[PDB]
Amino acid sequence: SGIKSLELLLQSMSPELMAGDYVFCTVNGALSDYLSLEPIATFREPEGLTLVLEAEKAQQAGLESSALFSLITLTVHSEAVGLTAAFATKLAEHGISANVIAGYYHDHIFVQKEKAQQALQALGEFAQ
Amino acid sequence: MSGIKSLELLLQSMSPELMAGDYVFCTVNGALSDYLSLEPIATFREPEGLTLVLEAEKAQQAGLESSALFSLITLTVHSSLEAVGLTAAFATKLAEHGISANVIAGYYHDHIFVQKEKAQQALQALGEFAQ
Numbered sequence A: 001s002g003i004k005s006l007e008l009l010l011q012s013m014s015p016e017l018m019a020g021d022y023v024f025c026t027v028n029g030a031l032s033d034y035l036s037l038e039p040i041a042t043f044r045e046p047e048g049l050t051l052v053l054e055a056e057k058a059q060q061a062g063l064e065s066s067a068l069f070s071l072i073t074l075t076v077h078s079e080a081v082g083l084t085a086a087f088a089t090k091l092a093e094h095g096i097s098a099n100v101i102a103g104y105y106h107d108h109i110f111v112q113k114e115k116a117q118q119a120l121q122a123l124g125e126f127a128q
Numbered sequence B: 001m002s003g004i005k006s007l008e009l010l011l012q013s014m015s016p017e018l019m020a021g022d023y024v025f026c027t028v029n030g031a032l033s034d035y036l037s038l039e040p041i042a043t044f045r046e047p048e049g050l051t052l053v054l055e056a057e058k059a060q061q062a063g064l065e066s067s068a069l070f071s072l073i074t075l076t077v078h079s080s081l082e083a084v085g086l087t088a089a090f091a092t093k094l095a096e097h098g099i100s101a102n103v104i105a106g107y108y109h110d111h112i113f114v115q116k117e118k119a120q121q122a123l124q125a126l127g128e129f130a131q
Helices: A004-011 A031-037 A055-060 A083-093 A113-123 B002-010 B056-060 B086-095 B116-126
Strands: A014-017 A022-027 A041-045 A048-054 A069-075 A099-102 A107-112 B016-018 B023-028 B042-046 B049-055 B070-075 B102-105 B110-115
Touching (some): A014 A113, A022 A055, A083 A113, A083 B002, A099 B042, B002 B086, B086 B102, B086 B116
Antiparallel strands (some): A099 A107, B016 B070, B042 B049
16 A cells, blocks of 8 residues: 555546747846746756746847756655656656656646657557 | 666775765745745756745745755766666666665756665665676
């Protein structure tokens, strides 16, 4: 019953592909300097500020970014350990890299834009 | 054959490093600009509100109420934002020891928030290698 409580958690898992193209940038400066860019996500690394922002905004401000990513919010309904291992393994099996940002309420997964539809279908296999 | 490349990554050290500080997760209302003075290490704009990841006592005496304490581990292992198998590898190493991870992918490295009490065990799990 400690085994199968994870399989129950995974069955309640529900992926949601969100709107917008995203890019990861790294900048040097105060977070305050980049507020007008309205980034969805922020991380202060010792190497500099990570901005996750709409690809539109990134090139309007002419930042050297990354490949385009799509955002999948991951919901569970609703607990045990192994959730991240499970969804990341499922994505890995389809040659999809998962760049996860834990928010307060949900896990947010950034996948290659070209692989977004593939990732949604793969993660949607759990609720069956 | 994508599953075998994942296995090869699992069998490697994540080269973990424990960072200074106790961290907490918070959800707040309104603009990030309101909270700049708190100097959050991480930010996420969720539909349900702004997530802030903050030093324990920066959050505590800003009146945001007690969260569970987190330690921060960075993976120094060499990788990009499109290396398939890496999240599965580190997430698996942690799960094998009963450790839940709150992962934030940075531009350069993955950063993992684990419960403060499990910080040394997370280092041990993450630092495991085959050869």
